[PDB]
């Protein structure tokens, strides 16, 4: 009954990216992905080890109310060499729901920006999809990339990214119940390698 991917029986994640398109993309399009998830049981990380990096809206509260199986950790190795900055998310379910998608950016485990969005069902192939596509990146985060990208040393980037975390909570708006809560922790990938992720189940 343990998850094989990032999702529950009640809300799969299909794809997720954050990307930059250069102003030169109007003529000859190209995409650069800082992070990307496109979609044997997932490896397991104790939720108590990563309380310190998120508020106390907090990870402890949200796991306490549950459900435990909805909680996931993604480590990202960002690709940080490369305009419009966008984040695209897509989800699926078998229910018609209305989704509310709360993205908390935390620096040293304090909330620094929050984004909250709604997306309603679109029935496609017996399936409900929720397309949150090309949402413009929050200005702090685009600034946090340009500043982070000019660091002399990648261990400096990881040192900064050590204290930079993001908490996404996806809830049915109507029923107010939690569907999917994802903890993001960041490293920089080396320049020759592109973006990577490892996805864990948060347990207790």
Ligand X SMILES: *C(#N)N1[C]C2=C([C]1)C([N]C1=[C]C(C(F)(F)F)=[C][C]=[C]1)=[C][C]=[C]2
Residues that bind ligand X (CB under 6 A): 18, 34-35, 87, 103, 105, 113, 115, 135, 137-138, 141, 166, 168, 184
**CB nearer to ligand X: pick between 2 and 191:** 191
Nearest to 77 by CA among 182, 192, 167: 192
* Minimal distance, residue 18 CB to ligand X, in Å: 3
State which residue, 115 or 131, has the beta carbon closest to ligand X.
115
Nearer to ligand X, 141 or 181 (CB): 141
* Radius of gyration for the alpha carbons in the chain, expressed in angstroms and rounded: 17
Strand partners, 150: none
Q: How far is the CB of 158 from ligand X (least distance, A)?
A: 15
Which lies closer to ligand X via its Cβ, residue 2 or residue 143?
A: 143
Closer residue to ligand X, CB minimum distance, 98 or 135: 135
Nearer to ligand X, 35 or 202 (CB): 35
In the numeric block, which tokens belong to residue 71? 């909680």
Task: Provide the 3-class DSSP secondary structure of residue 165.
Answer: strand
Residue of closest CB approach to ligand X:
138
In the complex, what is the shortest distance from the CB of residue 164 to ligand X, in angstroms, rounded to a whole number? 9
User: From the CB of 138, what's the least distance to ligand X, in Å?
Assistant: 3
Residue 116, Ramachandran bin (φ over 0: left; ψ between -120 and 50: alpha; else beta): beta
CB of 34 to ligand X, least distance (A): 5
CB of 199 to ligand X, least distance (A): 12
Q: How far is CA 12 from CA 41, 68, 128, 193, in A?
A: 15, 15, 10, 27
For residues 91 and 6, what is the distance between their CA atoms, to the nearest angstrom?
10
Strands (E), the chain: 12-21, 32-38, 44-46, 71-78, 84-93, 98-107, 110-120, 122-124, 127-136, 164-172, 178-188, 196-203
């Amino acid at each position: 009954w343990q998850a094989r991917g990032l999702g529950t029986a009640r809300l799969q994640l299909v794809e997720f990216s954050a990307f930059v398109e250069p102003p030169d993309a109007v003529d000859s399009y190209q995409r650069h992905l800082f992070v990307h998830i496109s979609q044997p049981p997932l490896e397991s990380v104790d939720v108590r080890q990563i309380y310190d990096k998120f508020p106390e809206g907090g990870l402890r509260e949200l796991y306490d109310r549950g459900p435990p199986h909805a909680f996931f950790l993604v480590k990202f190795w960002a690709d940080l060499n490369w305009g419009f900055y966008g984040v695209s998310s897509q989800y699926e379910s078998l229910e018609h729901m209305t989704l509310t998608c709360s993205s908390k950016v935390c620096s040293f485990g304090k909330q620094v920006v929050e984004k909250v969005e709604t997306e309603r069902a679109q029935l496609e192939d017996g399936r409900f999809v929720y397309r949150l596509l090309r949402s413009p990146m929050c200005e702090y985060l685009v600034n946090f990339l340009h500043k982070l990208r000019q660091l002399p040393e990648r261990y400096m980037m990881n040192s900064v990214l050590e204290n930079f975390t993001i908490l996404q909570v996806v809830t049915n708006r109507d029923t107010q119940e939690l569907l999917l809560c994802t903890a993001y922790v960041f490293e920089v990938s080396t320049s020759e390698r592109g973006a990577q992720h490892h996805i864990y189940r948060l347990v207790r």
